[PDB]
């Protein structure tokens, strides 16, 4: 009656995982100015997107079980580690330090946040040593018994952040090999799960900027016409909440103090970039946020937030729950200097549900950092001569819900974001990877000639 017939190249696919390869824009693929994420090895990208819209198709997405974020995480660590090998390691720096407070032109805030340390260092010859001095932030030294030492010396050595490599978060595109395709969910109301009414296939994704931060998403992509709240299980207090802003709120950060970079010869061809002296007044670093806009933004977050927890509930915000500095503070880096800002002023309000104020956030700075929350790995960021300031782009929050039962009409949300994947998960939620299956068999009235 009916007779098997085989078709090749039919449009069928299934969920899968593969080793996506990078693709970079012409600007980052030809300047060749030693970007840390190594886009020189990354292949130049396509001249323009080849987006193809798939009509009548419905596909299911899941941004919390997406393997794209897991692969991106591993790639970032390897790129960061692979960029520290060729430049100097600061193993001789683990020596006793004689430190004293700096009080030349100190402002009231920075009473004791800087230490003037002097130590004996090895000169070009292996049998003679010379006394040298450097300025160290208070958080990067600890007492031995004055006498001081670096925090890391009892944990591991530190590799100096090489001076020619740059940490600018330039975009990167993750593109799939042949036989695979990337599906983009173009629905505006799709949060993180469920069928996507409108789906399109792309050669590969848009430029994802690997911006590293905590409690806040900076220089990210914005939502469309609404604030989006996404969580693996909203009813579960242990799961983080990802907020996305439709309209960005600008935050300005700076390091007012003016300092000069100084080079110390620790060996043949090896130099340690110390902090020589501070020029002019010494003032604490800080960041500014427009109070009117931030208050307006919080009025939009609560509007969407109250839907999940009940329109009659009281919404309250509070600062972090305490603990390590890396978690309790909004970490980032302006230029090449790492910041750790106190966000206790942003998250302080209560909602009852019926132009230059510039909320300022004091920020502390460190030079010995455990970037990826690892143990036994270290990097030293040398000082940047001159003042530094930058304007940023807030586009989301990483909130965690303090557990209060219905025996309370109150929902206590505090900043969170310990795991670093959620930072990139905010942008890779649209994309999924599938495997093409061009083999198919269907029935029809067809014989062979014989």
């Amino acid at each position: 009656n009916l007779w098997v017939t085989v078709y090749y190249g039919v449009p069928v696919w299934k969920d899968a995982e593969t080793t996506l390869f990078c693709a970079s824009d012409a600007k980052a693929y030809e300047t060749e100015k030693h970007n840390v994420w190594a886009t020189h090895a990354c292949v130049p990208t396509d001249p323009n997107p080849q987006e193809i819209h798939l009509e009548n198709v419905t596909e299911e997405f899941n941004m919390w079980k997406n393997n794209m974020v897991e692969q991106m995480h591993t790639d970032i660590i390897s790129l960061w580690d692979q960029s520290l090998k060729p430049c100097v390691k600061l193993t001789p720096l683990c020596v006793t330090l004689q430190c004293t407070n700096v009080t030349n032109n100190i402002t009231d805030d920075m009473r004791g946040e800087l230490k003037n340390c002097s130590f004996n260092m090895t000169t070009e010859l292996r049998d003679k040593k010379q006394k040298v001095y450097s300025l160290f932030y208070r958080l990067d030294v600890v007492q031995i018994n004055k006498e001081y030492r670096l925090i890391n010396c009892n944990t591991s050595a530190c590799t100096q952040a090489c001076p020619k490599v740059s940490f600018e978060p330039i975009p990167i595109h993750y593109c799939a090999p042949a036989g695979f395709a990337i599906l983009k969910c173009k629905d505006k109301k799709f949060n993180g799960t469920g069928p996507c009414p409108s789906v399109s296939t792309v050669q590969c994704t848009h430029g994802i900027k690997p911006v590293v931060s905590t409690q806040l998403l900076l220089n990210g992509s914005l939502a469309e016409e609404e604030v989006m709240i996404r969580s693996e299980n909203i009813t579960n207090n242990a799961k983080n909440i990802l907020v996305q802003f439709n309209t960005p709120v600008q935050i300005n950060c700076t390091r007012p103090n003016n300092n000069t970079r100084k080079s110390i010869r620790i060996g043949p061809g090896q130099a340690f970039y110390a902090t020589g002296d501070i020029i002019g007044d010494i003032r604490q670093a800080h960041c500014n946020v427009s109070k009117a806009t931030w208050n307006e933004t919080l009025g939009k977050v609560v509007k969407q937030l109250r839907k999940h927890f009940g329109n009659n509930t009281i919404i309250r915000f509070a600062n972090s729950s305490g603990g390590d500095l890396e978690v309790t503070t909004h970490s980032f880096n302006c230029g090449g200097e790492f910041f750790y800002c106190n966000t206790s002023g942003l998250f302080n309000s209560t909602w009852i549900s019926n132009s230059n104020d510039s909320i300022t956030l004091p920020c502390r700075i460190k030079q010995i950092i455990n970037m990826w929350q690892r143990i036994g790995q270290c990097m030293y960021a040398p000082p940047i001569q001159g003042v530094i300031r930058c304007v940023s782009n807030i586009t989301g929050l990483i909130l965690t819900r303090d557990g209060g039962s219905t025996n309370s009409t109150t929902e206590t949300f505090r900043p969170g974001g310990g795991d670093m994947r959620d930072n990139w998960r905010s942008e890779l939620y649209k994309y999924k990877v599938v495997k093409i299956e061009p083999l198919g068999v269907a029935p029809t009235r067809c014989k062979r000639r014989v």
Partner: antibody
Framework: ERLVESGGGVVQPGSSLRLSCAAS????????MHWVRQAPGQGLEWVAF????????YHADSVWGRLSISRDNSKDTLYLQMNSLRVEDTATYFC??????????????????????????????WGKGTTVTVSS | SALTQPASVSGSPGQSITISCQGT?????????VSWYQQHPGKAPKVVIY???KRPSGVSNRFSGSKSGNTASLTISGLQAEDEGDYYC??????????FGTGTKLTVL
């Protein structure tokens, strides 16, 4: 190894004068210097000491506020400002070197800031000296 | 306040003599950095005992020095004609200053 002094003369009480010293044969920029004045029949009296770079100075109590010590490594010279001289100030001033060197420890040689010398606390080379007298 | 020294010391050739220098706990009893100097008329003094019990190069082995609490002394053995002259004692102070002694006159009979 020879310190040459100059500036001798006769001045009235309350006058001002400068004593100049020159050094050669050794690295003047690494070692501290002394000023010592001696009078006929009187024991040696110390005036002042200056670090190899001038960052630290010390003046004897007997002459505090009247005499100061200064140096200029760029010129390999040592200076002493005589201000408001009096009858008791007449004496022969000697331009002296502070013997010193690296501090041997743990098999290494330790030199001060900018490869400066540590003090061994004795005087080795002395200049011929200069004389100044006060009279009415 | 210079260190106290005997006004004069005498001794015939072939004898052994000692010159005493006394200070305070702040200067003499605080450090071993005590020096002795020999001087002749018309020339600046020369250091003979730069540390408490050591001598520089070029000086005779007859010299000897010692310290005892708040006092120090210089010993010369086998007195000879050329040993006649003046001697001074120096010591470091607690406040990084240097103090000389009153001086001693050595006479060879």
């Amino acid at each position: 190894e020879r310190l040459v002094e100059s500036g001798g003369g006769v001045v009235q009480p309350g006058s001002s004068l400068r004593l100049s010293c020159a050094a050669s044969g050794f690295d003047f920029s690494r070692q501290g210097m002394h000023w010592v004045r001696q009078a006929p029949g009187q024991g040696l009296e110390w005036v002042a000491f200056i670090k190899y770079d001038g960052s630290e100075k010390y003046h004897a109590d007997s002459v505090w506020g009247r005499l100061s010590i200064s140096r200029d490594n760029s010129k390999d010279t040592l200076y002493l400002q005589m201000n408001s001289l009096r009858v008791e100030d007449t004496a022969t001033y000697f331009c002296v070197r502070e013997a010193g060197g690296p501090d041997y420890r743990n098999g290494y040689y330790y030199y001060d800031f900018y490869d400066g010398y540590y003090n061994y606390h004795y005087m080795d080379v002395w200049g011929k000296g200069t004389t100044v007298t006060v009279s009415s | 306040s210079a260190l106290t020294q005997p006004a004069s010391v005498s001794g015939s050739p072939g004898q052994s003599i000692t010159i005493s220098c006394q200070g305070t706990s702040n200067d003499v009893g605080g450090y071993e950095s005590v020096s002795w100097y020999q001087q002749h008329p018309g020339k600046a003094p020369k250091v003979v005992i730069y540390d408490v019990s050591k001598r520089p190069s070029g000086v005779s082995n007859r010299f000897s020095g010692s310290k005892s609490g708040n006092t120090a002394s210089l010993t010369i053995s086998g007195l000879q004609a050329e040993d006649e002259g003046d001697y001074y004692c120096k010591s470091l102070t607690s406040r990084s200053h240097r103090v000389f002694g009153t001086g001693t006159k050595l006479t060879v009979l």
